[PDB]
Write a protein that binds this ligand. Structure first.
Ligand SMILES: NC(=O)c1ccc[n+]([C@@H]2O[C@H](COP(=O)([O-])OP(=O)(O)OC[C@H]3O[C@@H](n4cnc5c(N)ncnc54)[C@H](OP(=O)(O)O)[C@@H]3O)[C@@H](O)[C@H]2O)c1
Ligand SMILES: CSc1ccc(/C=C2/C(C)=C(CC(=O)O)c3cc(F)ccc32)cc1
Length: 318
C-alpha cells in the first residue's frame, strides 16, 4: 500500500508508525490487550505514569520477551513525564519509576507529557483550597535539560514533548546550549482537529508528529451527547464503505498518509487486530483533502483545569 512500517527520527532511531494506546485501558484488561497487540504485530506501545497501569502493561511486555515472540530491540516503548515531576531533581526518579513498572532498562522515547509544571507531591493535580491547580516555578527549558541528562545516562534513547504549541516547540529549539532536539511532538489529531500549521512547523524542523485520539476518544470520561462523533460521521463512513474498510481503519490510515505516527487505543482483541490491518489500502489525495475539510478545531483533551497556568498550550492559534 506504498506504506513503510517505521519512520526515521532525528536521533537516528526508527519508530513504528502504528502504536497501541493505553490511556483508560483498565489494569485488569491491559495485560491481555498488550499481549494480543504484540501477537498480531504491534511493536510500539504508548504509556504514561499518569495512566496508572504501567505495571500491568509491563507484565505483558515481559511475557512476550520471555516467550520470544519479539526481541527488545524490535519494541518501541514510549512513556511520559507527569506534570508534578518537572522539577530538575525529580525527573530522573520519575523516569526510573516508569522503567521499574514497565520492567525495562531503557525507554525508546520519553516525553514531557504537558508543558505545564505542577507542585510536586502525591496528587497528580494538586489544588489550592479554591480549586485551582498549583503550578511549579520550574520552567520548561530546565526541565528539558533534565530530560537531556536521561539520554546521557542511558535511561532513554530519545526525548520529546507532548501538547506543546508551536511557540513552545520554538522555545526549546532556541534554548541556549540545547544538546538534543525533541525527536517527537505528540498531539491530538483527527479529522475534527487537523493541525495543519503545527504539523507543518514540526515536520519542517525534523520533529516527528504522533497523532493521539485518532478515533476521537469515544471513551473519554467527559464526553457529552452534543459532541461530534467521528466514528458516526456518515461522510467518513462513506469513504470507509468505498474502500471496504471500517470507519476506524480509515481514521487510522488518515494520519499515516500525512507522515504521522498514530496510536489508537483498544482493549478489545477484535478491534486491536482490526486497527492494525491498515497497510492494505490507500486513500486518494481527494479522500485525504476531503477528510481534512472536516476540521472543527474540536479537542478531546483541552486540559480545562489549567487555562490560567502560564504555560497552558491552547491559547495560541497553534
Ligand atoms: N499525550 C497526551 O496527552 C495524550 C492524550 C490522549 C491520548 N493519548 C494517547 O493516545 C491513545 C489513543 O487516544 P484515546 O485513548 O484518547 O482515544 P482513541 O484511540 O481515539 O479511541 C479509543 C476508544 O475507541 C474505541 N475503539 C478502538 N478501536 C475501535 C474500533 N476499531 N472500532 C470502534 N471503536 C474502537 C476504544 O474502545 P475499546 O478500548 O473498548 O475497544 C476506546 O473507547 C491514548 O490511549 C494515549 O495512549 C495521549
Ligand atoms: C484536575 S481535574 C482534570 C484535569 C485534566 C484532566 C485531563 C486529562 C487528559 C486530557 C488526559 C489524557 C492525557 O493527558 O493523556 C488524562 C489522563 C489521566 F490519566 C488523567 C487526567 C487526564 C483530567 C482531570
Amino acid at each position: 500500500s506504498h506504506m513503510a512500517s517505521r519512520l526515521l527520527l532525528n536521533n537516528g532511531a526508527k519508530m513504528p508508525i502504528l502504536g497501541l494506546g493505553t490511556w483508560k485501558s483498565p489494569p485488569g484488561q491491559v495485560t491481555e490487550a498488550v499481549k494480543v497487540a504484540i501477537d498480531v504485530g504491534y511493536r510500539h506501545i504508548d504509556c504514561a505514569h499518569v495512566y496508572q497501569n504501567e505495571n500491568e502493561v509491563g507484565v505483558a511486555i515481559q511475557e512476550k520477551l520471555r516467550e520470544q515472540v519479539v526481541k527488545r530491540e524490535e519494541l518501541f516503548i514510549v512513556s511520559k513525564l507527569w506534570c508534578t515531576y518537572h522539577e530538575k531533581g525529580l525527573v530522573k526518579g520519575a523516569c526510573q519509576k516508569t522503567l521499574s513498572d514497565l520492567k525495562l532498562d531503557y525507554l525508546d522515547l520519553y516525553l514531557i507529557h504537558w508543558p505545564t509544571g505542577f507542585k510536586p507531591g502525591k496528587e497528580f493535580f494538586p489544588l489550592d483550597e479554591s480549586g485551582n491547580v498549583v503550578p511549579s516555578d520550574t520552567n520548561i527549558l530546565d526541565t528539558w535539560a533534565a530530560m537531556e541528562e536521561l539520554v546521557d545516562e542511558g535511561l532513554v534513547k530519545a526525548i520529546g514533548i507532548s501538547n506543546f504549541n508551536h511557540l513552545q516547540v520554538e522555545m526549546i529549539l532556541n534554548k541556549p546550549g540545547l544538546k538534543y532536539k525533541p525527536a517527537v511532538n505528540q498531539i491530538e489529531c483527527h479529522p475534527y482537529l487537523t493541525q495543519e500549521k503545527l504539523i507543518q512547523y514540526c515536520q519542517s524542523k525534523g520533529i516527528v508528529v504522533t497523532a493521539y485520539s485518532p478515533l476521537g476518544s469515544p471513551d473519554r470520561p467527559w464526553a457529552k451527547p452534543e459532541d461530534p462523533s467521528l466514528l458516526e460521521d456518515p461522510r467518513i463512513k462513506a469513504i470507509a464503505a468505498k474502500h471496504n474498510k471500517t470507519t476506524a481503519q480509515v481514521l487510522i490510515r488518515f494520519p499515516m498518509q500525512r507522515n504521522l505516527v498514530v496510536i489508537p487505543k483498544s482493549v478489545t482483541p477484535e478491534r486491536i487486530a482490526e486497527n492494525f490491518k491498515v497497510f492494505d489500502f490507500e486513500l486518494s489525495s481527494q479522500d485525504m483533502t476531503t477528510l481534512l475539510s472536516y476540521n472543527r478545531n474540536w479537542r478531546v483533551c483541552a486540559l480545562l483545569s489549567c487555562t490560567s497556568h502560564k504555560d497552558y498550550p491552547f491559547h495560541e492559534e497553534f
